[PDB]
Amino acid sequence: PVIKVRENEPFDVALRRFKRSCEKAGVLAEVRRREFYEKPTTERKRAKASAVKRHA
Amino acid sequence: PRRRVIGQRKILPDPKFGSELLAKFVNILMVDGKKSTAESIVYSALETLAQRSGKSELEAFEVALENVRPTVEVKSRRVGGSTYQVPVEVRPVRRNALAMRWIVEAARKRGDKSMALRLANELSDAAENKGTAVKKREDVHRMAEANKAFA
Amino acid sequence: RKQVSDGVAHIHASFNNTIVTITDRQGNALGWATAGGSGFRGSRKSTPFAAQVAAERCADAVKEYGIKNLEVMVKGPGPGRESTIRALNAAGFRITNITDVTPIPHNGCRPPKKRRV
Amino acid sequence: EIDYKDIATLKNYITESGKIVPSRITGTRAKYQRQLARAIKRARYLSLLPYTDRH
RNA sequence: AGGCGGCCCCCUGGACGAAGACUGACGCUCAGGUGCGAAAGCGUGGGGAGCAAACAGGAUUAGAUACCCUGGUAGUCCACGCCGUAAACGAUGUCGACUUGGAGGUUGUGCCCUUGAGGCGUGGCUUCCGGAGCUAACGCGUUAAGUCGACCGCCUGGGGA
Numbered sequence: 001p002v003i004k005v006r007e008n009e010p011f012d013v014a015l016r017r018f019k020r021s022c023e024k025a026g027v028l029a030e031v032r033r034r035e036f037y038e039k040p041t042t043e044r045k046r047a048k049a050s051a052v053k054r055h056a
Numbered sequence: 057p058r059r060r061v062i063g064q065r066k067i068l069p070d071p072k073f074g075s076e077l078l079a080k081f082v083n084i085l086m087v088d089g090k091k092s093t094a095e096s097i098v099y100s101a102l103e104t105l106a107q108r109s110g111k112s113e114l115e116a117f118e119v120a121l122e123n124v125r126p127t128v129e130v131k132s133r134r135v136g137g138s139t140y141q142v143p144v145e146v147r148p149v150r151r152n153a154l155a156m157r158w159i160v161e162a163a164r165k166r167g168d169k170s171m172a173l174r175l176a177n178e179l180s181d182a183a184e185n186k187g188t189a190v191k192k193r194e195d196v197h198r199m200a201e202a203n204k205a206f207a
Numbered sequence: 208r209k210q211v212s213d214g215v216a217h218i219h220a221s222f223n224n225t226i227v228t229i230t231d232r233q234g235n236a237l238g239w240a241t242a243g244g245s246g247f248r249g250s251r252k253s254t255p256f257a258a259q260v261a262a263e264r265c266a267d268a269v270k271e272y273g274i275k276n277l278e279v280m281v282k283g284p285g286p287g288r289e290s291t292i293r294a295l296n297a298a299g300f301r302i303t304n305i306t307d308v309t310p311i312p313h314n315g316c317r318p319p320k321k322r323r324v
Numbered sequence: 325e326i327d328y329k330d331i332a333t334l335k336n337y338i339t340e341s342g343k344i345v346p347s348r349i350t351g352t353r354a355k356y357q358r359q360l361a362r363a364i365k366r367a368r369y370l371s372l373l374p375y376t377d378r379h
Numbered sequence: 380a381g382g383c384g385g386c387c388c389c390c391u392g393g394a395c396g397a398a399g400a401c402u403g404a405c406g407c408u409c410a411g412g413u414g415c416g417a418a419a420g421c422g423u424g425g426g427g428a429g430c431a432a433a434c435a436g437g438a439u440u441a442g443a444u445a446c447c448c449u450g451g452u453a454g455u456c457c458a459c460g461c462c463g464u465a466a467a468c469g470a471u472g473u474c475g476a477c478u479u480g481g482a483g484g485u486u487g488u489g490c491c492c493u494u495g496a497g498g499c500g501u502g503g504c505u506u507c508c509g510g511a512g513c514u515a516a517c518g519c520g521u522u523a524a525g526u527c528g529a530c531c532g533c534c535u536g537g538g539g540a
Contacts (some may be wrong), residue, residue: 001341002377005213005276006303011296014279017293018218018304021281024339025309028222028283034312035317037431041418043318205256205290306377311343313365313385316429317455324448328386344385358384366386 064149071116072099081156101175110179120182124189125155128200143200143207155193162188211237212275216265218282218291225258225287229269235268237272240265242287258287262294274302281308327358328363331372338364342376 003014003021067079072095086094106113126146133140146154159182166174166188181187214237217228221243221322229238243252251257262285279295279302282288325334329372337352337360339345344364347357 001280001306001308003281003305003308004303005278005301007301007304009299009303009324011292011300011302014302014305015289015292015296018279018281019289021305022283022288022307022309025311025343026284027281027309028220028285030309030311031283033318034316034321034429037321037429038318040317042320044286205254205259307339307341308345308376309341310434311341317431358386362386364385368386 068200071095077152078117080153081160084153084157085160097171097175100172101179104172104176105179108176109183116183117179120179120185120187121152121155121159123185124158124193126151126193126196127159129154129196130199130203140206141199141202141203155189158192159187159189162192208272212273213270214272214274214277215280216277216295217280218288219280220258220285220287220289220291221253222283222285223253225253225261225285225291227265227287227291228280229263229265229274235276238265238269240268242291253286255286256289257290259290259294262291263297265291266295266298267295270298277303279305281305285322286294301316325352325359325363327359328367328370328372331363334360334363334373338373342374344373350353 003018067076067083069076070078070082081128082091082095082098085097096194102113102117109116111119125148128143130141130143131145133142135200159178160193163171163178166178175189178187178189182189208279211231213232215228215230215232215234217230217236217239219226219228224241224243226241226244227239228236229240230236231232231249240261242258245264247254247257247260277300279292325337328334336348337345337347344360347354347360350357351352352360
């Protein structure tokens with residue numbers, strides 16, 4: 001994805017935008033779901049465990 | 057201090073100089089409550105110190121101190137298991153005592169005849185910050201900056 | 208060399224390290240540096256200022272081409288991807304916008320099992 | 325949503341990188357969001373909503 | 380029911396919202412009996428990204444046949460069977476009748492100028508609070524763990540098992 005350079009704009013102002021851009025999903029965080037091997041029973045209860053955590 | 061806030065004792069002003077800030081130095085130099093001999097140790101040095109100052113005697117004392125003043129120091133966090141050091145700007149009220157306290161502790165580690173030669177030289181050195189104390193702050197100057205992002 | 212004035216700093220900010228690569232538009236990488244290839248070992252490799260220093264070491268040896276602009280590549284969570292970009296700020300660079308570069312698998316490989324530590 | 329041919333409004337359901345935004349943030353009926361995917365993944369081969377900006 | 384989620388066609392199948400005809404007990408239960416049947420594995424023909432048993436290498440440890448790290452066989456994906464077992468749980472047999480309540484959701488559907496996303500009924504399912512009641516209590520509590528009708532199923536100290 002193109003992250004383009006404009007005129008007169010310091011690299012610091014986008015610094016906030018840089019992490020905000022991919023934090024929406026998280027490249028390595030979703031990488032966290034291909035690093036090892038997981039049983040689907042994990043996610044389903046992961047959904048189950050996460051589902052319970054999601055009930056304020 | 058966890059529940060009760062605390063203050064600092066209002067040490068008496070100098071009998072000869074009449075300075076409270078200079079009072080902590082003698083108390084810092086004061087040992088085993090020897091105010092009888094403590095201020096004489098302070099009184100003698102600047103009189104010799106003034107001779108090798110040219111600029112003045114009482115102000116010469118401050119010029120060397122600014123060289124060793126602790127601007128920043130590290131307060132540990134010790135929460136999770138790694139020895140965290142979160143830096144903080146120290147109030148100069150305690151800073152000067154640290155500045156004065158450190159200068160005193162370095163004179164004892166010298167080979168001259170006496171602290172009159174040792175103390176007179178160190179502050180004269182501290183005037184251009186070339187004594188034991190001034191390098192001590194520089195050492196403190198890197199612990200708060202090498203761990204800067206780790207505040 | 209060769210004057211380009213428009214480069215590309217691909218920031219790979221790993222959980223242990225933050226590696227950023229300089230490249231041109233076609234993608235032909237011109238330069239590349241790592242936070243962990245910049246001092247820090249083990250724990251210290253994955254620290255922001257470690258990613259910040261990586262940018263210092265990555266930000267140099269890529270303007271020797273006379274690069275004047277360079278589009279950036281965000282990558283994953285971790286210590287870098289924020290300090291590296293900040294150090295890149297130190298040189299007085301320009302950047303229009305920053306766009307997410309995340310490959311979002313739509314239910315691909317079987318997930319990882321948590322480290323039973 | 326209803327059809328794959330109107331990618332103009334389909335674009336509000338996609339982030340700038342081509343990954344379909346959660347309808348939860350967009351809202352939309354629970355059934356309606358499904359029609360979005362029907363117009364997106366398969367209709368990909370009709371070039372409706374971009375992958376991302378890589379090439 | 381397990382179990383079912385990227386998109387399209389065939390077919391299915393089940394399920395509920397409004398009236399109108401149809402026949403009239405043609406109903407519920409079921410030993411035996413009959414089908415299906417989460418996951419893994421295996422047999423057999425393929426496939427083959429991730430990987431990950433077993434199994435190889437590097438670390439801790441006094442020791443670590445493990446946890447920490449690099450590999451890794453099987454297998455996981457398309458075709459025929461077997462195996463038919465699991466926390467297959469709401470720990471809640473099946474069908475029909477009665478019963479304060481409270482508060483939402485969703486799903487039909489009439490009504491109401493929608494006079495506006497609303498107001499007023501008529502069904503289904505379901506979410507949370509709870510009268511009574513009852514329970515060893517725990518709590519359940521109009522989807523009853525409160526009040527009745529039929530069939531089926533089942534238990535008689537602990538271990539051995």
